[PDB]
Design an enzyme around this catalytic site. Structure first.
Site: not given
Lengths: 243, 277
Positions: B8, B10, B129
């Site tokens: 979504y 850099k 995550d």
């Protein structure tokens, strides 16, 4: 949808300890919406029940509302609110709060088609973020529900219903202004006792807990007893007609 | 944005004007002007970081700001700045001399990464995550958990989407589409553990169905009471065959984290209380 079950490493160890610690992170509002120059407590109660209803009707997760309430107030300390605008604000809050605390968010369309432009809303959401400096999440009354049950030794077998039944009452209660002065810890305790007093459901006489909770949360037993009353009242004053 | 230069979206490392040319890593998050406001995750992400920031826990990255510049011309843009760290637990390994990290440098990071994890859980936060890419390494060898845009406060009866962790590091529970919780981080740890002793992803896989087996071929096949007859009943082949050069203790630690039944899988807390340390 799959729904979170127990997790001792999040429900049985020294966590009240941090909940408390983190509770002491955001100072008590000396006077609810003290900085408002146009909208009032009365205005909040009305809006809050329209939000409560937004979440209950759309079945968001229980910790959504208590957070949207939390956001709204913290937001309405810094910036100013207008009745012609409250609708928008309150709506923004929920949106953010659902994004955080709930897996199924409250889409904007579904929140504007219920009121402002679906864009002026995005703005108001943003205006709330930078204002609060993206520091939204907070300690909800709800976060103490199981931890409190755990510490009070309330037999795991009932946790499901208790959680469900109490989380419910704590949510309506949260609508009222006198409750916004209390600590999430207490509010939760109050609502547990309150709830516990509706079909024993195998729980001891609520009595037995008041003294433990005094020790658990660290408050005079009187204070505990009071908040139970207090909460069981705001719970009562719930009234959809006010809309 | 204004006083920031990126040497979504850099992840551009940059230097802030104010501080002494300091390095304030920039994570410009993109907000497609559809109809939903700030990205759902870039919120929970900053939310959790802002909440626990007063503890200044060593093993957690530090968020500094959320620029956000409203534009009347085109859409608005987000400048999410954290503290800069040199390399992610990945890089460290791609460029770490042979044979990788020393049984000591390995034991350390696992203690930290597990330490911060223990912390994060204590506040009912489940960072969903955990992977080499998401761990950071200070030039002095310290760990920093990052990319918190999946982490969230875990509460009883909460609703869940069984879509946690990148295919490889996913725990059994999330692959069988079942319910999950905290042990989702312990598993995701065992993986990152094995993946240090031998700079190579213990459980590479192609699909969820496949991802499950690769894992089953290694750890074996749990019983009826360690299961929430599809897969096979092959004798779990000694892990010493999958993770090269591992202590007899570390052995136990990895097999404490890469357990199938999450209801048994050791907790970040006691994992730090484990002999290997």
């Amino acid at each position: 949808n799959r729904a979170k079950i127990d997790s001792t490493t999040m429900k049985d160890p020294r966590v009240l300890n941090n909940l408390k610690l983190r509770e002491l992170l955001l100072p008590k509002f000396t006077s609810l919406w003290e900085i408002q120059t146009e909208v009032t407590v009365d205005n909040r109660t009305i809006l809050l029940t329209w939000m409560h209803l937004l979440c209950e009707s759309f079945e968001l997760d229980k910790s959504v509302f208590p957070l949207s309430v939390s956001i709204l107030d913290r937001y309405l300390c810094k910036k100013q609110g207008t009745k012609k605008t409250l609708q928008k604000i309150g709506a923004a809050c929920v949106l953010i709060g659902s994004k955080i605390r709930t897996v199924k968010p409250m889409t904007v369309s579904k929140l504007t088609y219920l009121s402002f432009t679906n864009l002026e809303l995005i703005n108001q959401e943003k205006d709330i973020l930078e204002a609060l400096k993206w520091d939204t999440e907070a300690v909800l009354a709800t976060d103490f529900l199981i931890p409190l049950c755990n510490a009070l030794k309330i037999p795991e077998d009932l946790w499901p219903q208790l959680y469900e039944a109490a989380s419910t009452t704590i949510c309506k209660a949260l609508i009222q202004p006198n409750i916004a002065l209390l600590s999430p810890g207490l509010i939760c305790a109050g609502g547990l006792l309150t709830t516990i007093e509706t079909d024993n459901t195998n729980c001891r006489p609520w009595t037995c807990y008041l003294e433990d909770l005094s020790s658990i949360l660290n408050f005079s037993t009187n204070t505990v007893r009071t908040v139970k009353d207090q909460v069981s009242e705001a719970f009562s004053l719930y009234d959809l007609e006010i809309l | 944005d204004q006083q920031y230069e990126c040497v979504y979206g850099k992840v551009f490392k940059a230097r802030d004007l104010k501080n002494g040319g300091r390095f304030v890593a920039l994570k410009r998050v993109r907000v497609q002007t559809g109809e939903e406001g700030m990205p759902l995750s870039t919120i929970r992400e900053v939310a959790v970081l802002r909440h626990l920031e007063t503890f200044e826990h060593p093993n957690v990255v530090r968020l500094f700001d959320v620029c956000t510049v409203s534009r009347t011309d085109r859409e608005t843009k987000l400048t999410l700045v954290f503290e800069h760290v040199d390399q992610d637990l990945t890089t460290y390994l791609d460029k770490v001399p042979e044979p990788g990290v020393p049984t000591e440098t390995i034991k350390d990071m696992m203690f930290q990464l597990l330490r911060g994890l223990d912390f994060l859980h204590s506040h009912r936060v489940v960072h969903r995550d955990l992977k080499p890419q998401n761990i950071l390494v200070t030039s002095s060898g310290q760990i920093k958990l990052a990319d918190f845009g999946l982490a969230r406060i875990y509460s009883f009866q909460m609703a869940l989407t069984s879509v946690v962790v990148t295919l490889w590091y996913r725990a059994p529970e999330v692959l069988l589409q079942s319910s999950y919780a905290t042990p989702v981080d312990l598993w995701s740890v065992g993986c990152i553990f094995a993946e240090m002793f031998r700079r190579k992803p213990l459980f590479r896989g192609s699909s969820d169905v496949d991802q499950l087996g690769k894992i089953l071929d290694v750890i074996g096949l749990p019983g009826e009471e360690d299961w929430p007859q599809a897969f096979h009943s092959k004798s779990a082949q000694p892990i010493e065959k999958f993770v090269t050069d591992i202590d007899e203790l570390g052995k136990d630690l990895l097999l404490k984290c890469l357990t199938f039944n999450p209801a048994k899988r050791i907790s970040a807390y006691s994992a730090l209380s484990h002999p290997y340390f």
